[PDB]
DNA sequence: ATCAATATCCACCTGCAGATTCTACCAAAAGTGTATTTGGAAACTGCTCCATCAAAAGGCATGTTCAGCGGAATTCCGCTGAACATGCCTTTTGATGGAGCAGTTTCCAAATACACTTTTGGTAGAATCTGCAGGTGGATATTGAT
DNA sequence: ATCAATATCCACCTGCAGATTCTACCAAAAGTGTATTTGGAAACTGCTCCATCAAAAGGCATGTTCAGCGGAATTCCGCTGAACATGCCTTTTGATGGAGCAGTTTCCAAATACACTTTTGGTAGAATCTGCAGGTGGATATTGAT
């Protein structure tokens, strides 16, 4: 019993050109990338949604969490797809 | 409050506001010493041979009872030379002698052996003294000291004298069970007192007699000298 | 009259010498 | 048991000896000119030739349990 | 119209100044200075002065920590007149991207 | 005790009971040998060695002599009867050493006195056949036949500078026995002002572990006996304080006998099992 | 149909809200947010892996080995900023010859 | 609008001699400025996201504090 | 002397309810330890202890009775144990320390 | 009109060791933001600590682990050493 | 338990300057840094161990030394 | 026999081992070390040989840090070699503690 | 080397904030007694992995050789800088008008907990695939001495 | 400007070493409906804490003006880099001996959730001594001209 998104980013890897494999000690060094980015956003969410003075896990301030710890443009245009996502998730109504 | 750690700094001034006297026939001696300092890989017991040395007790059935005229010789500083032989002689060989006291061996299967018989590579001198050709006097090593030019030796007396050593080896060793009359030690418990062969080591053996044997020669520089002493 | 080994066993030494302690 | 044991003891009871040995040839070899001027009256025909003796004694010391491991290990 | 050996004031001013520890800067020029570079990212954004402050002795302690290093990096050089690749090799060898 | 200690020039009783009388609680006098220390108990069994001996001091091969004594080590693991009967010297005062095994192994540091005559012993401090503490002294014993100058010292101005050439550590044991401290923390205090002296600049005082090869919260031990230890006003500060001036000026004027470390021929000997 | 599948994205939804329920602290939370959560670590992953392609049409070398891993992973430039305290094992370093 | 020159040359000296050093390069004005303004934006871009979650458009010291607290040069003393 | 208690029992300094919900306001997971959870209690009182006995040491060293910032980190990045324990707490504006570099020095 | 504080205590323990040593707010504030900020930051790691060993009890075993490796031994020692003392006055069930 | 001072192995560096971009080495380095390598494995055994104790365990895992090397500071990727 | 210029096989295996990325440090120096600076401060302690790697590539990774930037600090020091107090130099400039 | 010249160290008056020090109200608890999941030490319990040991080349390593530009430095020439000096910008400490946040009220997506029903991703099994990493043969860079 | 022995690029050829890629399985967190709540949304409003300017003093710009220090050229010389002989220890690749694991059941103080309760810490603030920063004075630490 484990975790990984393995077959996850091989979906992506097949969004892409698909026809690559990947070394199979880089699946664990992305997996590491995968697991310390989730856990450097899930830290930094426990702790604005701490020090902003509310007890609801919220949205917005995870927003500009992600936003600020990232570099520039790729976040800007991450969260607009990231919004993109969350809008047709719910807009399916 | 705490050991410190180290780095630090110091300021020398500012404000912070029945003599004895026996060694005369005991002692004696004079001792060298140079630059140069006196070498030595041997052990003791080398250098005194016989373990042994003895008593008042032992010697008056010897010496004040018979010694004006013995018919042949019987000296003091002899008695121990020839008593240390044998003991040591059944040494090596019978363990079992200890133990069991009713059983100590006898010389009367002693004979062939001990005449012959070695105290340890006992005339070690001969097999170098017969090309060393010494023996125009007789042998003395550095761990011979000053008492026996003038004494004799051994295996010649046993024709002499030699049935009348052992028999008083016999009647004080065993009120211990088994000890000599200096006692060995706390000895017995130590509880409370009271594939090479092929290139390198086939050299083994060769380097040293390579050098037992010049120092011969080296030698030979004084021992070619004892006529120009004559 | 007694010089018969004194004769030739000083130089024999460096041959020794040359030998053993001198590779 | 094995030859190196008897190879290293004959190199650790030989702690003393090539340091011996490099001091053996001296003390003498220093004083061989004192008969070239003798050309004193009991001596150093004796004494002085004792640590000769044993300069030829101190190594036959070595001897008495070594020299049968030669025969008895290569069996 | 008389003076010392030129330049031995400079321990002086090393002996007034780091034996202080006071702010330095008039504020009002840095606070015109933040607020003509908060205008680039947000419109109408106010400041606490307590925070002015802090940003100062902030900006201080980095250029302090500067300082120290070109120092030192200049005398390792045999030498103690900084300039400009000192400090950057400086920055890239504190690291700040 | 058990039939006072007839030797020298000093009559003395035995401080600890019985050790060599295991099979000799039976005679009166006990007579001492010196150089290789193999006595005799009753009488006549000892006094024939005067015809025997050909060595005149424990046999060590120097590398030291000074004009006044001589200082040995022995190899321990070579010697067999002579590494045991030191110990049986060392038991009838000294008993604070470990005797788990009637002890082979371990190194000899051993003292005697030139003397024409005869090699007049003194007494020694010891070294295990193992190195995992440091071990700068392990066992030391005087007998009181040799015990009033700084000779008695002299054992702890040795030790160090064995670590000079073997340059590591030396460590005391859990034995902390007493008078030597009136040596040990003595000698060991005031060799911070043969280094205070010098070194104007900052004392790192972890190079007394390379200057004078000792540990260094042990050393400030006997210098916060000493107390020697300011701090607090932007330092820590050794602080030179002025009871010193004399002190040091003390032993700048009335000076005694040394040594001298190119007087050494040793090399530092690591052994073989494991 | 399912969670995911309102979304449309590859990452299961409960998975991440799992993974965003375990380590939190407060107990309640806006669940449509973890909707663009899920996609938080997304684009960001995305962005990294066809961003290891560049010798990969004129290498024709199928697998990314882990110094090829790296070696346009560093030229990620502006995430090793992200990659500040990044350590990659078998990576290794570029050739900066000054 | 201009003024990152008045953290001037006897400033920079004054807080140089802070850092100690002596032998000034007088070319060093225009990177000190920009090392400034370098951490100054470094510093004041998440003071901004810090204030600007809060729904708030001043600036305390608490939002700033976080925002030096999470980078890697925390200060003290306002909170 | 008395037999009620204010959780009077641990040689205490503070209060203990207040910092347990300092605990339970980190509240990530859900099981604490109750009573031993007051070690933090020891854990505070160990580190003020540590540095306001220093923070005693420099007021007589100037004669100066009341203390202030700029000398508690002249102390603390003097302080060996504690510089670098919180080297990266910066404090308000009091300066660092004053250190002139031996080799600068060339009596000129 | 609303915050936790901790300065009496502080200054309780400052009085305790000398009855003559002054403070100010400014110091107040500077070492009121220390001791909140060590008190989180080894919040932070403890938490982190007896979260990923698997355990769902927060323990003095994982912050007593914690602060020997959170703190540097010497005064970490000091502060094992006074939680000893601490927990065997912790220790008495009892009335006295 | 052999231990003594192995750690004097090799100027390994002449290979980790090829891994480095540097130019000549002449050596002579090596004693300190041994003894900074020395320094960095003690400060990371020391964390090391205080955690393998924390768990009750006995060996090294290798989430111990990834969050050791997270605590004193770079991140190891990819060994748990 | 032919002999090269100094610096430009240098060179080679430069170009070599930029261009490699294999296992550096030995493994069995490395384990025999970590064993024995293991078994000291308490009960000697098992390992897991992929943290013995980690350990490999911690101290390599370390290092190769401090040689980049020791390689900066020396090439702008105008020597080439590498000493002892740009080491210093570079662990105050790294911020040991 | 001997006074002028600063410019520092120490110490005695002086007007504050102003810490601080105790009082004071009361809010909000800490600390309390007791019911309860519940997380937990641990005993069992097989075992992976951690070690000792065999054993023999192989790739490195540690030799000594020796020849060499890299570095350490000092030189005579050169200079942007630092140090007392004259005029000036503003900043500093004096002075007044608004939003916003901080709080206080209410209204509902929305979440937890339960209680259900699935897919699908975990292990893992191994057939088939092929990638690629490694080895081998022609054409092409690459430098030291002449 | 040129010879010419070393080293690498690039196409061709293969062992095998996992990879992948499903088929199975299985078992299990996940999606979703329903009830309670509840925390945030957010709208109103009060008067902090921002907003802005007018006089001196003081940093400061700007000197002027020589200099300790930079500083490359040139110098010696060194401890090392290339290279080569030879010990010689890792690194296997099995072979094996044994244990401190990582579980899964395991019963059990005890944290932990409920609400009384009597101090008592937070703020709120006033008394008022006094600590002390700084003005003033005395005496002198450090250092120039000739």
Same mark, same amino acid.
């Given at each position: ?11 992506? =890897? ?15 060094? =992305? ?38 710890? =990232?570099?520039?443009? =790729? ?19 | ?39 030595? +890989? ?25 010694? *004006? ?33 009713? +059983? ?12 012959? +018989? ?28 000053? +008492? ?11 024709? *002499? ?58 030698? *030979? ?10 | ?23 | ?75 | 119209?008389? &003076? ?9 001013? %090393? ?21 003509? %570079? ?40 045999? &030498? ?6 000192? %400090? ?8 700040? &991207? | ?97 470990? @005797? ?40 030391? @014993? ?133 | ?98 | ?79």
């Amino acid at each position: 019993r484990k975790e990984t998104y393995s077959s996850y980013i091989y979906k992506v =890897l097949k969004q892409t050109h698909p026809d690559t494999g990947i070394s199979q000690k880089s699946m664990s060094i =992305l997996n590491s990338f995968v697991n310390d980015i989730f856990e450097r956003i899930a830290t930094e969410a426990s702790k604005l949604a701490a020090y902003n003075k509310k007890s609801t896990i919220s949205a917005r301030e995870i927003q500009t969490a992600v936003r600020l710890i =990232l570099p520039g443009e =790729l976040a800007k245009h991450a969260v607009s797809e990231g919004t993109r996502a969350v809008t047709k998730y719910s807009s399916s109504t | 409050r705490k050991i410190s750690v180290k780095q630090h700094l110091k300021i020398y001034l500012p404000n912070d506001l029945m003599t004895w006297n026996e060694y005369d026939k005991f002692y004696t001696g004079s001792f060298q010493e140079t630059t140069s300092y006196i070498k030595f +890989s041997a052990t003791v017991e080398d250098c005194c041979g016989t373990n042994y040395n003895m008593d008042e007790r032992d010697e008056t059935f010897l010496n004040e009872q018979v010694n *004006k005229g013995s018919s042949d010789i019987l000296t003091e500083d002899e008695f121990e030379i020839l008593c240390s032989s044998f003991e040591h002689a059944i040494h090596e060989r019978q363990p079992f002698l200890s133990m069991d006291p009713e +059983s100590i061996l006898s010389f009367e299967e002693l004979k062939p052996t001990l005449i012959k +018989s070695d105290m340890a590579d006992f005339n070690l001198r001969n097999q170098l003294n017969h090309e060393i050709n010494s023996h125009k006097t007789h042998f003395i090593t550095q761990f011979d000291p000053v +008492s026996q030019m003038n004494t004799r030796p051994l295996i010649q007396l046993i024709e *002499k004298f030699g049935s009348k050593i052992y028999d008083y080896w016999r009647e004080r060793k065993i009120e211990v069970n088994g000890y000599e009359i200096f006692p060995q030690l706390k000895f017995e418990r130590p509880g409370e007192k009271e594939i090479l062969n092929s290139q390198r080591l086939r050299a083994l053996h060769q380097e040293l007699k390579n050098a037992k044997d010049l120092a011969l020669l080296v030698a *030979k520089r004084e021992n070619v000298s004892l006529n120009w002493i004559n | 009259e007694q010089e018969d080994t004194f004769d030739n066993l000083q130089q024999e030494i460096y041959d020794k010498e040359t030998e053993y302690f001198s590779h | 048991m094995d030859p190196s044991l008897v190879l290293e003891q004959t190199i650790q009871d030989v702690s003393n000896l090539p340091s011996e040995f490099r001091y053996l040839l001296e003390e003498i070899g220093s004083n061989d000119l004192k008969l070239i001027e003798e050309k004193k009256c009991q001596s150093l025909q004796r004494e002085k030739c004792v640590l000769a003796n044993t300069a030829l004694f101190l190594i036959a010391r070595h001897l008495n349990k070594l020299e049968k491991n030669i025969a008895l290990l290569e069996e | 119209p008389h &003076r010392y050996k030129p330049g031995t004031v400079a321990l002086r001013e %090393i002996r007034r100044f780091q034996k202080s520890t006071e702010l330095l800067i008039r504020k009002l020029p840095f606070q015109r200075l933040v607020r003509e %570079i908060a205008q680039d990212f947000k419109t109408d954004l106010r400041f606490q002065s307590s925070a002015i402050g802090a940003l100062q002795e902030s900006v201080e302690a980095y250029l302090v920590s500067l300082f120290e290093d070109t120092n030192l990096a200049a005398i390792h050089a045999k &030498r103690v007149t900084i300039q400009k690749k000192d %400090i950057k090799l400086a920055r890239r060898l504190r690291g700040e &991207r | 005790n058990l039939n006072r200690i007839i030797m020298g020039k000093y009559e003395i009783e035995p401080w600890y009971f019985s050790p060599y009388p295991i099979e000799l609680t039976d005679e009166d006098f006990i007579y001492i040998d010196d150089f290789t220390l193999q006595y005799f108990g009753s009488k006549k069994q000892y006094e024939r060695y005067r015809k025997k001996c050909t060595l005149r001091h424990p046999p060590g091969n120097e590398i030291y002599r000074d004009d006044y004594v001589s200082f040995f080590e022995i190899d321990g693991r070579k010697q067999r009867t002579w590494c045991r009967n030191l110990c049986l010297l060392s038991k009838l005062f000294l008993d604070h050493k470990t @005797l788990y095994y009637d002890v082979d192994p371990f190194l000899f540091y051993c003292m005697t006195r030139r003397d024409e005559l005869g090699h007049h012993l003194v007494g020694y401090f010891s070294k295990e056949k193992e190195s995992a503490d440091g071990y700068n002294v392990a066992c030391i @014993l005087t007998l009181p036949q040799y015990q009033r100058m700084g000779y008695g010292k002299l054992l702890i101005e040795f030790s160090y500078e064995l670590s000079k050439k073997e340059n590591k550590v030396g460590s005391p044991e859990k034995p902390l026995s007493d008078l030597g401290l009136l040596s040990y923390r003595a000698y060991w205090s005031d060799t911070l002002i043969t280094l205070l002296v010098e070194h104007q600049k900052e004392i790192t005082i972890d190079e007394i572990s390379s200057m004078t090869s000792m540990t260094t919260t042990d050393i400030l031990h006997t210098a916060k006996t000493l107390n020697i230890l300011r701090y607090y006003k932007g330092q820590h500060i050794i602080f030179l304080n002025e009871d010193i001036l004399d002190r040091y000026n003390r032993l700048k004027a009335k000076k005694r006998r040394t040594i001298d470390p190119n007087r050494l021929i040793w090399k530092p000997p690591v052994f073989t099992a494991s | 149909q399912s969670s995911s599948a309102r979304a449309g994205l590859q990452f299961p939804v409960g998975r991440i809200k799992r993974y965003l329920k375990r380590h939190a602290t407060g107990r309640t939370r806006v669940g449509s947010k973890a909707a663009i959560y899920l996609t938080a670590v997304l684009e960001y992953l995305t962005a990294e892996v066809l961003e290891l392609a560049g010798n990969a049409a004129k290498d024709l070398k199928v697998k990314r080995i882990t110094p090829r891993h790296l070696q346009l992973a560093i030229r990620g430039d502006d995430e090793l900023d992200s990659l500040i305290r990044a350590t990659i094992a078998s990576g290794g370093v570029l050739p900066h010859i000054n | 609008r201009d003024n990152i020159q008045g953290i001037t040359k006897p400033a920079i000296r004054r807080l140089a001699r802070r850092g100690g050093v002596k032998r000034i390069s007088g070319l060093i004005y225009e990177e000190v400025r920009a090392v400034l303004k370098s951490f100054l934006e470094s510093v004041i871009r998440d003071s901004v996201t810090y204030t600007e979650h809060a729904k708030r458009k001043t600036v305390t010291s608490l939002d700033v504090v976080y925002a030096l607290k999470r980078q890697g040069r925390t200060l003290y003393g306002f909170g």
